[PDB]
Ligand binder design. Structure first.
Ligand SMILES: O=C(O)c1ccnc(C(=O)O)c1
Ligand SMILES: O=C(O)c1ccnc(C(=O)O)c1
Ligand SMILES: [Fe+2]
Ligand SMILES: [Fe+2]
Lengths: 342, 342
């Protein structure tokens, strides 16, 4: 009952029909409660953000000027700088960090990155659609200098007044980046966490977002810190291995479906699983990543979950450095705990 | 064949008989090779010490003046400062660190410490012997200022020329202390390691010493660093729990029996198990503990075993401090490795 997931699908204005329907959602093995959908003026929303809990804001106008963006408009105005585009023979686009590939030679990426011009991206899509292909593409490109003047106009129209005040109220560091995400229906980014505070602005299409608090670290089994898939869950949500990952049986999520105009606050360290609804067409999103606030005066107990995750990360990093080889980290940790702490 | 243990018992000079016999040795579940017994002039002994491997030196005259020490002589000359004396209803005298008891309230020492004057110690022994008691005593007291003039005379007679040169050649730090150990036949100090370099000078009676290199950390299962029995093996050598401690089945020792005049180099981090031969009478030993050498320029790979032990110790210490509670160390380490590194 309380695990109502994304809830009853919203009705679009002027009787244009249900935004989406249950059958566009993938099927998973865990329960989920709904993320609150609130007005930016609702003091409850300010409460959730201040407390680093997720909330969907329905009326920020954060990216009002971008709501007009489609492929046509963007190809026309975005410039001809390079755009990273990932390809995969599967619906899953597992993130990997290429700077860490050097030290796991045995890692072979499922998806491949290719730089290209926007028009080329648009062509590949049309090409795949008209030939019924099963290939999938996901453009994921940070918003840089080579963008056209109209796109820059839109950018300036963003609700900087609102977000700059959020940045200020939360003591967050600088805006590190804005990622532009354009994906095909059915695309999935497997569960992971980021060490950035994130306002995730939905623009075109609908995305189902499933989040897990940092205190579910134990149920989600991140890769080793030195692995390319650092911060990504090892668990295949489509075929969970309960032998390797027993506690995934205890995992409980928070979920919501976002559409044009919604902004989802994804607090730093919160796991998130993001998928573009089945048969919902392409999706477009722009995120806003901010460095988190500085670590307070000195430590205050009890520690929050995210501080414990930070401590584990640091242990793993320092051990890799001390041993002189990230590959020796596991054996040493085992030696340390077997028959001693387990 | 190569696992010949302490070897053929030595013959004492002038046909006074075998120093000791097999039946005075306790029975254990692992194999052992003999520690080399060499002359201080043997360049092989200098080799072993430089390489931090154990060696028994037969002719250092390190504590020549103390070879006359018996209870009578000591009670007469040692002063009347306080002497720590441990009592136990068992042959095992497990070392515990009282400064760490505060944070494991559930730990109850097997042996109890009582301060007393030397003559009182001598009395308790006589008392126990004449009444056939099963109680056991082990005096373990650092050699301080309150010692009489004759004992100080002996002390000055020690072979400082030889040992000071060892300290020098090995770059070791200062002499931290000299412990005086007086134990009843059959007494056992369960296996442990020390973060000091040790010349262990045998004076009266015979002790069987079993050492394990630092690279057997995995087979010996030390208590947690914050526990009172930090550095002690959890394994009961008399009834080994192969379920909890599977790798103790792989443990291999180096052993030797030392007598009046022998000095055993016990390199820093080497595990040692020390027992006073059954039915061999009281034993007397004086050790010489030196801070180890400083850590070289910077790290050189590959790391030695003892450097890995140091790294594990530091991880455990820093985690205790970060979490603000040593009790949370185990749960966090488990969370870190389960389904990730194991
Ligand atoms: O919308 C995406 O597919 C996505 C996936 C994972 N992470 C982010 C992010 O903005 O943190 C966005
Ligand atoms: O002779 C002892 O019982 C003993 C036991 C454990 N450690 C030492 C030492 O000198 O390191 C001495
Ligand atoms: Fe993310
Ligand atoms: Fe010791």
């Amino acid at each position: 009952a309380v695990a109502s997931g994304s809830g009853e699908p919203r009705e679009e204005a002027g009787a244009l029909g249900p935004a989406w329907d249950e059958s566009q959602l993938r099927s998973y093995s865990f329960p989920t409660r709904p993320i609150p959908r609130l007005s930016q003026s609702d003091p409850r929303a300010e409460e959730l953000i201040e407390n680093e809990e997720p909330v969907v804001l329905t009326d920020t106008n954060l990216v009002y000027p971008a709501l007009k963006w489609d492929l046509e408009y963007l190809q026309e105005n975005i410039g001809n700088g390079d755009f990273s585009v990932y390809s995969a023979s599967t619906h899953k686009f597992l993130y990997y960090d290429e700077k860490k590939m050097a030290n796991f030679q045995n890692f072979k990426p499922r998806s491949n990155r290719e730089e290209m011009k926007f028009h080329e991206f648009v062509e590949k899509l049309q090409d795949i659609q008209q030939r019924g292909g099963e290939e999938r593409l996901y453009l994921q490109q940070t918003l840089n200098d080579t963008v056209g003047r109209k796109i820059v106009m839109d950018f300036l129209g963003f609700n900087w007044n609102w977000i700059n005040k959020q940045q200020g109220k939360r003591g967050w560091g600088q805006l590190t980046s804005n990622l532009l995400l354009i994906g095909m229906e059915g695309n999935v980014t497997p569960a992971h966490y980021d060490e950035q505070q994130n306002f995730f602005a939905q623009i075109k299409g609908y995305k189902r977002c499933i989040l897990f608090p940092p205190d579910q670290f134990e149920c989600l089994y991140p890769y080793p810190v030195h692995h390319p898939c650092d911060r990504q869950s090892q668990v295949d949500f489509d075929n969970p291995d309960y032998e390797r990952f027993p506690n995934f049986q205890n995992v409980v999520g928070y979920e919501t479906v976002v559409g044009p105009g919604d902004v989802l606050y994804i607090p730093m360290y919160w796991w998130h699983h993001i998928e573009s609804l089945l048969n919902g067409g392409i999706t477009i999103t722009v995120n806003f990543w901010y460095k988190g606030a500085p670590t307070p005066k000195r430590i205050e107990y009890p520690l929050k979950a995210h501080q414990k995750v930070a401590i584990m990360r640091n242990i793993e990093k320092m051990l890799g450095e001390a041993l002189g080889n990230p590959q020796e980290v596991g054996p040493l940790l085992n030696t340390m705990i077997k028959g001693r702490y387990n």
